[PDB]
Design a binder for this molecule. Structure first.
Ligand SMILES: [Zn+2]
Length: 274
């Protein structure tokens, strides 16, 4: 066991999924830090160093990392793999990014199984000496992710279907909402230029009042102020922060992908009174 195979990912969700597949034969690090906004992140010379010292680079694609392709052009002789191949996208509904794939596909546990398979294939291709380990670790982790879906689905099924309105800041939950039958309301369709401008806030407020939706949420990498303004003006409580674009730090309450899905579902369910 000389030097461990080095994997660099764009963001933290992919870091943790890949690290479960890598086990003890590879070390996986994220370019973005926990809590950092990932869509419009501005890479630094230090990020170039980290990616250039890697043996493999993993990214989401599907219009997530607006910075990645320009950044990767500075990197020489390091293979990359997009981890979302084979996932059917949901289009973004409105705004200047309307009609392109919504990148947040990892919020569906079923889609996470495809992330796992794509990461496994990339590690086996670029580090074939450890293929048996990657295959073993991917099978075990896929078992955990597959089993995760049933209790989450049952928990959210307790909310009456007519009342299943998921009101968030970024429209980052479209894949989770599809899986579990929630209608989707948001202050902005995807992180970008305008987040909480008028017109956006007014539309969400109107839907909340028309349907008597009991709760609204924010997310861990963006401002909570728009959601709190919406809750102040309506009958909805502020349900707290959902985790989608980043894990917490490893000593925080959301250290892993499994913890992120569980925490987000638990926070939604509690917002609805379980
Ligand atoms: Zn996002």
């Amino acid at each position: 066991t000389a030097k461990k195979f080095k994997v660099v990912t764009t963001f933290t969700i992919i870091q943790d999924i890949a690290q479960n597949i890598a086990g003890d034969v590879a070390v996986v690090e994220s370019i973005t830090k926990p809590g950092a906004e990932i869509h419009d992140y501005q890479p630094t010379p230090r990020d170039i160093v980290k990616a250039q010292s890697a043996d493999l680079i993993l990214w989401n694609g599907m219009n997530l990392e607006r910075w990645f392709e320009k950044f990767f052009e500075s990197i020489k002789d390091v293979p990359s793999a997009v981890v979302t191949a084979g996932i059917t996208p949901l289009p973004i509904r409105e705004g200047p990014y309307s009609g392109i794939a919504n990148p947040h596909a990892w919020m569906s546990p079923s889609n996470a199984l495809i992330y796992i398979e794509n990461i496994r294939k990339a590690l086996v291709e670029h580090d074939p000496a450890h293929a048996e380990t990657y295959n073993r670790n991917a099978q075990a982790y896929a078992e955990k992710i597959k089993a995760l879906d049933a209790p989450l689905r049952e928990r959210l099924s307790r909310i009456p279907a007519e009342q299943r309105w998921l009101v968030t800041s970024e429209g980052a939950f479209s894949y989770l909402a599809k899986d579990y039958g929630f209608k989707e309301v948001y202050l902005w369709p995807i992180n970008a230029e305008q987040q909480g401008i008028p017109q956006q806030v007014r539309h969400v407020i109107d839907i909340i009042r028309e349907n008597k939706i009991p709760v609204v949420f924010s997310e861990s990498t963006i401002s909570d102020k728009p959601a709190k303004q919406v809750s102040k003006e309506t009958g909805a409580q502020y349900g707290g922060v959902l985790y989608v674009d980043s894990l917490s730090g490893e000593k925080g309450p959301v250290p892993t992908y499994i913890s992120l899905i569980n925490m987000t579902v638990d926070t939604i369910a509690k917002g609805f009174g379980q």
